[PDB]
Amino acid sequence: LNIAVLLGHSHDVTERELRNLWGPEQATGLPLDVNVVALLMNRTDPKSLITHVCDLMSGARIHGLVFGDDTDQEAVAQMLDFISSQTFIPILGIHGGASMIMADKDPTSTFFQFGASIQQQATVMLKIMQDYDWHVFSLVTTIFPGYRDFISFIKTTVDNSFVGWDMQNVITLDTSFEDAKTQVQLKKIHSSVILLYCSKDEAVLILSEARSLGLTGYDFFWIVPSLVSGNTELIPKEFPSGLISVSYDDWDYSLEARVRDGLGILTTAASSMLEKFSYIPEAKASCYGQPLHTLHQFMVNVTWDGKDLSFTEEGYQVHPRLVVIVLNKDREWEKVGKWENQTLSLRHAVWPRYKSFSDCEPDDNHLSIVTLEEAPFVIVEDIDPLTETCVRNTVPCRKFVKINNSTNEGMNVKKCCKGFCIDILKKLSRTVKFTYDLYLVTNGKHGKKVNNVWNGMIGEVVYQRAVMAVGSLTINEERSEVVDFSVPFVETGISVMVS
Amino acid sequence: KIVNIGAVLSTRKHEQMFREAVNQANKRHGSWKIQLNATSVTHKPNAIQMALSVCEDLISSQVYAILVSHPPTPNDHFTPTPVSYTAGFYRIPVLGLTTRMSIYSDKSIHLSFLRTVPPYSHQSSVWFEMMRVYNWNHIILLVSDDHEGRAAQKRLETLLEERESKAEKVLQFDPGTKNVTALLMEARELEARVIILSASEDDAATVYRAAAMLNMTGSGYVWLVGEREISGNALRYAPDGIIGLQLINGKNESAHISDAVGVVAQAVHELLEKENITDPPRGCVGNTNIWKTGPLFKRVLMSSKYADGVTGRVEFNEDGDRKFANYSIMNLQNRKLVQVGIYNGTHVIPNDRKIIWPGGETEKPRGYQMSTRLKIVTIHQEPFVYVKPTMSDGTCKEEFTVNGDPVKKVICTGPNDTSPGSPRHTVPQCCYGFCIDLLIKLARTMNFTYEVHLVADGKFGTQERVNNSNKKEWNGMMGELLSGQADMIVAPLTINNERAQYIEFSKPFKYQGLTILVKKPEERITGINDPRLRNPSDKFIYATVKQSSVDIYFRRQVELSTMYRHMEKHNYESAAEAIQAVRDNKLHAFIWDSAVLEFEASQKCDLVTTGELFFRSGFGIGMRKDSPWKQNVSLSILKSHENGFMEDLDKTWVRYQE
């Protein structure tokens, strides 16, 4: 039907590509009169919002409003939610402040957002923590609002997960910190992974206190949400290089594809509601002056061109597109990973160190360890599909399995390991109390020199791509020439098997 | 050198009082050159063009404080939201004065909203003061308004964090329906009588009529409501003797306006003493730049401490609420509002008037009556729970044993078969045996009736992912107990560390270990230390009951994952299925408790147990949390331990051989 798409942008996004968004789109047109009104607004005040709503609602009874924002104002989405409550018109928020996450909607309002809420983002972040076995962690909550729901969601998620999370007690705040009573709660922290829920101007002081108290070590982790991480240009120098963030800001999908998907959802809802009831277009005539069949609880079942764009009970997407980013050494928000329907994808399955967060951090405690698949020593099995977690005695590792012989591209499949040398390495980690980097070799067997070129674990250790070989390895003359073996611990010779 | 104050006020007398308070605000503040102007607007019956007129008039006026002071509005929406949102676009504090909705408490939504009235959830803290006075622990929550229901649950958990108790029943549903009396009867069957209600007038009158028709307003029924529930037809439908709350000067607008003028005036004179002064621009035309001292002026309003006013010590918390609020506690004595208490910010004092209750005496009714009919659920244990079909119609054939002991059966209710086998066939049959005689001994010791029914499946209950939202749930006897449908599990409960974290345990009545059922070259296995069972094959077929606690005990064992992967392909529904399968020589081993297989070896000589005795544990009675049915019942169990009644139960089934 009549749908108006108004866009408030600062970047030069023209209007004629929205005029071309009507022709080939909706080839199977079930409404007999589908019309679009493309408009561009330069100002971002709510007076213009009220003015354009009174213009377009009286403009031949437009039943669809689509808005995107370029600024950093979350109150514009609340104003559009109030407009959708008053005018009873389904309004969609696309980008920026029109897509910023709000807490609770109303049954009188039919406003919807194309975004990712903080609850699903916390689910994704705890999925990241489950996939890394980072079970000993903490939680610091400030006086930034929407925080008790976050604590309660963490409590219910820990109570409904197979991990059994070792969670340190919640460090709470009251005001801006005096560094007298909050100092005691920050000095209780001895765990690695630190979670935080605050604003950016609070996070500057939090990271300044954490650097002042030395909480930015190589062991210590920092995972922040998307609401504290604001503009991609405005990055202060107090951020640790390696800051984990999760935001749905995908640069691969532009605003035009998102509003095309929104128009597809609107036409899908209109065509599916027209098949049930006849008198579907019902709007308000004009603003000046003193509903039963609605699309508020109808388009939960929606799928546009195979894309799972279904809607939740709260009004958000069922399966959005989350993007896991970090902060590199070049002070840029580096795009790392994308998210699937329910499961999580990882382009960089190898977790990077970023061990030098600042300039003066002399740290050399990690150890690169590789082994080889042998049955009585390193039992290499799949991950448990019921838990998606290696059991207590098994440890995770990676294996670079190639797809074919046509390309050299492969995937680092993560698997579980147990056995003899796994127990030896775990007891070495108990005694020495170091940090290890366990993975598998994909070159082949133990070692063989082919024209001054070694292979396997010898090629990994001699060419210094690892540190030491904990797994099983025979000892002869040239291997003792190229590296330095330790003392022997097990008496393993050779034998001949007969009947 | 001017400060503008915007207001949405109707009556001309209160506009004159507001202008008089603005004029008197500059009296004691010296001859300083600051000026105060006030701009008040009326109200058009609509809400969009009202928001338009007010927002552009306050942009053209460049005000600092925005006030809405309209209680008696005919629209029940009570929404000053759009003007507050427009001021939050430039982070300008709007001081709401009338409504008490919890949607305004969210500062993430309402970025620049302040108020001098608390929400109703703080009244629950006053009701927690009732818990500080009347010493009542178990409550029954009923909230219809789901916009404030999550905040009420949050405040209730915050209050219960101190005592570390739990609410017995919580309810959230859609306002507008009428058939909520089923959950009212389910709350009536509970031990507590404390009724906490949080809804509008219509749902309050509906549940008053529902309690009046079903007579839930008799003796001991605790009723405790607020100001919204004692107005309109809910006041007409209210029973006599109900206890409610009253906001002192909650609707008295004239002193409230002067208090707001004093608060805003001292906030402005505090802000004038500091630097970085910014002004709101002409945001209607060509100005989207935000007012930079928004959170700065908010921080000025955070530490605002006052000492003037008829109400008293007005003070803001971290949520910007009202501290130290005088409340009144009213009683409805024969359709007349009678004051029975006063409340300062921390303490309740009843007045000289008496507290007349809807039940009996004027003292507090202890509405914690324990269940005299304990709902008993059990599983069909083969030597312990004998279930026999009825002879003609719901009867039990009173047969006699060989030792002159008449079998005292009971009419239990149980399903017929499994759910793919039997869709719906639940009949009353005759239950007797070991734990039935234990319950007879318990009913002989302590006078209490009971209700023996059966669990719907043949499983103990395991901790399994439900198929949505990644949530842990229980099932079986634990799933029927934690849902409130059961009261006491009388069954040989396998005591472990996981279930001890969730419920409380009693003393074990049975003490035994584990063993292997075989049929009679090494015909024996001698326990878990057989190396062929460490690395099994398709020959040695060994398994256990599906979803049993033995599987959980092996799941804790992190060195026997091979048996956990092997036995999952052959888990049966019941142990009698395993007995029938090894009777046909299809099984080879079965981990099970000791004395059950000893009794079955006494019944059938081909059934052979193993020699070792590992996991020497005890079986007791499945129980609830902290409850008065724990100590006396445990003393009765120990009284059964000390005498020869355990030997009598041995003479019934254990010592008796063939």
XYZ file of N, CA and C in Angstrom, chain A residues 42-48 50-51 54 71-76 78-79 82-83 86-87 102-108 130 143-149 152 156-164 173-175 197 284 287-290 384 386-388 391-393 418, chain B residues 44-49 51-52 55-56 59 77 79 81-83 85-86 88-91 103 105-111 146-147 150-151 154-155 158 283-288 290 298 302 318-319 463-465 469-473 502 555 558-559 561-562 564 568:
384
model
N 16.758 17.125 6.542
C 18.095 17.580 6.909
C 18.216 17.831 8.409
N 17.139 18.283 9.043
C 17.120 18.532 10.475
C 16.631 17.297 11.226
N 16.949 17.247 12.520
C 16.630 16.104 13.370
C 15.821 16.525 14.589
N 15.000 17.584 14.454
C 14.197 17.948 15.612
C 12.834 17.257 15.572
N 12.220 16.988 16.735
C 10.904 16.321 16.735
C 9.770 17.174 16.191
N 9.958 18.494 16.081
C 8.984 19.343 15.402
C 8.822 18.935 13.944
N 9.939 18.655 13.263
C 9.870 18.151 11.896
C 9.267 16.754 11.846
N 6.809 15.622 13.882
C 5.367 15.843 13.990
C 4.818 16.450 12.702
N 5.580 17.367 12.092
C 5.134 18.036 10.871
C 5.045 17.061 9.701
N 2.122 14.609 10.258
C 0.852 15.236 9.902
C 0.729 15.511 8.408
N 22.269 10.460 13.492
C 22.805 11.076 14.698
C 22.925 10.033 15.808
N 23.200 10.499 17.022
C 23.374 9.645 18.189
C 22.332 9.968 19.254
N 21.080 10.125 18.834
C 19.987 10.493 19.724
C 19.008 9.330 19.806
N 18.910 8.717 20.987
C 17.990 7.609 21.197
C 16.566 8.063 21.501
N 16.346 9.364 21.712
C 15.005 9.856 22.005
C 14.137 9.960 20.759
N 14.747 9.932 19.570
C 13.984 10.016 18.327
C 13.159 8.752 18.124
N 12.014 6.981 20.600
C 10.934 7.078 21.578
C 9.832 8.009 21.085
N 10.212 9.090 20.395
C 9.228 9.968 19.768
C 8.449 9.244 18.677
N 5.970 7.004 20.305
C 4.787 7.759 20.715
C 3.900 8.098 19.520
N 4.513 8.408 18.375
C 3.756 8.679 17.152
C 3.014 7.428 16.691
N 0.022 6.988 19.005
C -1.074 7.922 18.770
C -1.775 7.694 17.437
N -1.017 7.455 16.371
C -1.563 7.366 15.028
C -1.947 5.948 14.621
N 15.618 0.225 22.938
C 14.812 0.708 24.048
C 14.278 -0.481 24.841
N 13.790 -0.197 26.049
C 13.526 -1.271 27.004
C 12.189 -1.960 26.749
N 11.085 -1.229 26.894
C 9.758 -1.838 26.895
C 8.811 -1.038 26.019
N 8.098 -1.732 25.136
C 7.127 -1.105 24.256
C 5.749 -1.106 24.917
N 4.729 -0.729 24.151
C 3.349 -0.685 24.596
C 2.469 -1.421 23.597
N 1.350 -1.999 24.052
C 0.393 -2.585 23.101
C -0.291 -1.554 22.223
N -0.365 -0.295 22.660
C -0.942 0.756 21.832
C -0.005 1.188 20.711
N 31.502 -19.237 26.760
C 31.392 -20.690 26.825
C 32.311 -21.356 25.810
N 25.911 2.768 37.866
C 24.574 3.315 38.038
C 23.948 3.697 36.695
N 24.510 3.215 35.591
C 23.881 3.398 34.291
C 22.597 2.576 34.236
N 21.485 3.154 33.786
C 20.185 2.482 33.920
C 20.046 1.280 33.000
N 19.028 0.473 33.292
C 18.872 -0.802 32.622
C 19.848 -1.849 33.098
N 20.276 -1.773 34.356
C 21.345 -2.615 34.867
C 20.852 -3.789 35.698
N 19.720 -3.646 36.393
C 19.209 -4.749 37.204
C 18.631 -5.858 36.329
N 18.050 -5.492 35.182
C 17.633 -6.491 34.199
C 18.829 -7.260 33.659
N 19.942 -9.674 36.445
C 18.987 -10.773 36.550
C 19.072 -11.716 35.354
N 19.904 -15.690 35.656
C 19.103 -16.743 35.037
C 19.876 -17.522 33.979
N 20.797 -16.876 33.261
C 21.556 -17.580 32.239
C 22.595 -18.508 32.861
N 23.228 -18.081 33.958
C 24.131 -18.958 34.697
C 23.356 -20.111 35.329
N 22.154 -19.834 35.839
C 21.320 -20.901 36.375
C 20.726 -21.805 35.296
N 20.779 -21.422 34.023
C 20.263 -22.241 32.930
C 21.335 -22.477 31.870
N 22.532 -22.870 32.304
C 23.603 -23.239 31.389
C 24.404 -24.391 31.976
N 24.906 -25.263 31.099
C 25.634 -26.466 31.501
C 27.041 -26.186 32.019
N 27.478 -24.928 32.052
C 28.831 -24.616 32.495
C 28.944 -24.726 34.010
N 28.041 -24.073 34.737
C 28.264 -23.885 36.156
C 29.304 -22.806 36.360
N 28.241 0.208 42.106
C 28.605 1.608 42.267
C 27.401 2.395 42.768
N 27.678 3.571 43.327
C 26.640 4.477 43.802
C 26.679 5.825 43.101
N 27.857 6.428 42.982
C 28.046 7.709 42.302
C 29.317 7.589 41.468
N 28.956 -2.730 32.321
C 27.747 -2.154 31.736
C 27.645 -0.703 32.202
N -5.687 7.117 10.208
C -6.271 8.353 10.699
C -6.228 9.407 9.599
N -4.301 15.142 11.690
C -3.906 15.342 13.082
C -4.927 16.187 13.833
N -5.486 17.197 13.176
C -6.463 18.069 13.810
C -7.810 17.361 13.915
N -8.382 17.375 15.116
C -9.654 16.718 15.349
C -9.743 16.041 16.700
N -10.884 16.194 17.366
C -11.089 15.615 18.689
C -12.354 14.762 18.725
N 31.310 -32.408 22.695
C 30.026 -32.986 23.076
C 28.890 -32.156 22.496
N 25.750 -32.263 23.211
C 24.739 -31.939 24.210
C 25.112 -30.706 25.021
N 26.408 -30.487 25.261
C 26.868 -29.391 26.099
C 27.598 -28.293 25.340
N 28.197 -28.619 24.181
C 29.085 -27.732 23.410
C 30.226 -27.222 24.296
N 34.663 -31.617 28.442
C 34.482 -32.003 29.873
C 35.689 -31.532 30.692
N 35.632 -31.682 32.017
C 36.708 -31.169 32.908
C 38.087 -31.708 32.520
N 38.223 -33.014 32.266
C 39.562 -33.540 32.038
C 40.038 -33.323 30.608
N 42.021 -35.784 25.459
C 42.347 -36.354 26.762
C 43.493 -37.339 26.568
N -5.511 20.971 25.635
C -6.520 20.636 24.594
C -6.837 19.146 24.746
N -8.092 18.685 24.555
C -8.438 17.275 24.814
C -7.601 16.259 24.047
N -6.867 16.671 23.017
C -6.002 15.755 22.284
C -4.657 15.629 23.003
N -3.718 14.906 22.393
C -2.390 14.720 22.969
C -1.249 14.968 21.996
N -1.477 14.880 20.686
C -0.414 15.147 19.723
C -0.194 16.648 19.585
N -1.276 17.397 19.348
C -1.165 18.838 19.175
C -0.892 19.546 20.493
N 1.244 18.170 22.651
C 2.691 17.987 22.698
C 3.395 18.956 21.761
N 2.793 19.215 20.596
C 3.341 20.184 19.646
C 3.335 21.599 20.221
N 5.793 21.830 23.231
C 7.210 21.705 22.903
C 7.720 22.934 22.161
N 6.966 23.452 21.177
C 7.459 24.663 20.522
C 7.320 25.908 21.398
N 10.378 25.646 23.589
C 11.566 25.980 22.808
C 11.663 27.489 22.611
N -4.863 7.347 30.732
C -3.515 7.048 30.260
C -2.456 7.656 31.172
N -0.275 10.352 30.701
C 0.969 10.369 29.928
C 1.465 11.789 29.688
N 4.458 11.930 28.890
C 5.640 11.426 28.191
C 6.198 12.261 27.027
N 5.418 12.827 26.076
C 6.083 13.433 24.903
C 6.833 14.722 25.200
N 6.352 15.533 26.144
C 7.074 16.743 26.525
C 8.369 16.378 27.243
N 10.023 13.632 26.654
C 10.903 13.096 25.619
C 11.534 14.214 24.797
N 10.762 15.266 24.514
C 11.282 16.416 23.778
C 12.322 17.166 24.603
N 14.127 15.637 26.889
C 15.232 14.699 26.918
C 16.021 14.646 25.630
N 15.463 15.183 24.541
C 16.260 15.390 23.337
C 17.363 16.418 23.572
N 17.125 17.395 24.449
C 18.150 18.350 24.853
C 18.555 18.193 26.313
N 18.117 17.109 26.970
C 18.469 16.750 28.352
C 18.079 17.852 29.342
N 7.147 3.006 34.555
C 7.790 3.244 33.272
C 8.595 4.541 33.304
N 10.329 5.328 35.951
C 11.487 5.021 36.778
C 12.699 4.623 35.950
N 12.489 4.141 34.728
C 13.596 3.776 33.850
C 14.237 5.046 33.312
N 15.443 5.351 33.788
C 16.167 6.512 33.289
C 16.793 6.274 31.921
N 16.873 5.021 31.464
C 17.314 4.763 30.099
C 16.262 5.192 29.088
N 14.986 5.116 29.455
C 13.904 5.571 28.594
C 13.688 7.059 28.826
N 13.441 7.434 30.078
C 13.222 8.825 30.465
C 14.565 9.393 30.915
N 15.289 9.995 29.968
C 16.677 10.385 30.205
C 16.780 11.568 31.161
N 1.771 -5.554 33.701
C 3.080 -6.115 33.392
C 4.131 -5.057 33.086
N 3.730 -3.800 32.875
C 4.710 -2.731 32.705
C 5.443 -2.438 34.003
N 7.544 -6.436 36.284
C 8.950 -6.816 36.381
C 9.680 -5.968 37.418
N 9.328 -4.682 37.516
C 9.905 -3.831 38.551
C 9.429 -4.232 39.940
N 11.366 -7.305 40.798
C 12.727 -6.892 41.127
C 12.811 -6.324 42.538
N 11.854 -5.463 42.901
C 11.833 -4.880 44.236
C 11.535 -5.938 45.292
N 14.663 -7.857 45.788
C 15.585 -7.012 46.544
C 15.237 -7.009 48.030
N 15.763 25.417 19.105
C 15.797 24.090 18.517
C 14.676 23.781 17.543
N 13.721 24.697 17.365
C 12.632 24.447 16.429
C 13.097 24.587 14.983
N 13.933 25.581 14.696
C 14.387 25.868 13.338
C 15.911 25.828 13.335
N 16.477 24.800 12.711
C 17.891 24.783 12.381
C 18.855 24.628 13.536
N 18.432 23.998 14.631
C 19.309 23.785 15.785
C 19.069 22.375 16.317
N 20.015 21.476 16.051
C 19.992 20.125 16.597
C 21.129 19.888 17.584
N 22.867 19.640 21.015
C 22.310 19.346 22.329
C 22.844 20.332 23.363
N 21.940 17.641 35.789
C 21.399 16.450 36.435
C 22.192 16.089 37.685
N 21.168 15.783 41.560
C 21.345 14.551 42.328
C 21.600 14.845 43.800
N 19.406 7.621 44.163
C 20.025 7.409 42.857
C 18.997 7.284 41.738
N 17.753 6.943 42.062
C 16.668 6.904 41.091
C 15.883 8.208 41.038
N 18.217 -33.227 35.094
C 18.345 -31.795 34.857
C 18.608 -31.574 33.373
N 17.558 -31.212 32.637
C 17.563 -31.270 31.183
C 17.238 -29.895 30.611
N 17.874 -29.578 29.484
C 17.573 -28.359 28.744
C 16.162 -28.417 28.175
N 14.807 -21.068 24.787
C 15.446 -20.025 25.594
C 16.608 -20.483 26.477
N 17.070 -21.730 26.296
C 18.223 -22.323 26.990
C 18.062 -22.262 28.514
N 17.046 -22.963 29.010
C 16.694 -22.948 30.422
C 16.734 -24.360 30.992
N 17.295 -24.489 32.192
C 17.262 -25.754 32.907
C 15.872 -26.022 33.474
N 15.420 -27.269 33.352
C 14.191 -27.715 33.989
C 14.382 -29.114 34.553
N 19.297 -28.018 45.896
C 18.007 -27.463 45.507
C 16.922 -27.672 46.551
N 28.098 -39.689 35.701
C 28.445 -38.477 34.972
C 29.388 -37.598 35.779
N 34.511 -38.568 36.126
C 35.115 -38.093 34.882
C 36.109 -39.078 34.295
N 36.242 -40.266 34.881
C 37.148 -41.290 34.384
C 36.425 -42.516 33.850
N 33.869 -42.204 31.247
C 33.056 -41.696 30.147
C 32.743 -42.773 29.116
N 33.540 -43.844 29.074
C 33.303 -44.926 28.123
C 32.030 -45.690 28.465
N 29.570 -44.326 30.102
C 28.505 -43.358 29.852
C 28.132 -43.315 28.377
N 24.227 -45.550 27.020
C 23.181 -44.667 26.520
C 22.408 -45.275 25.355
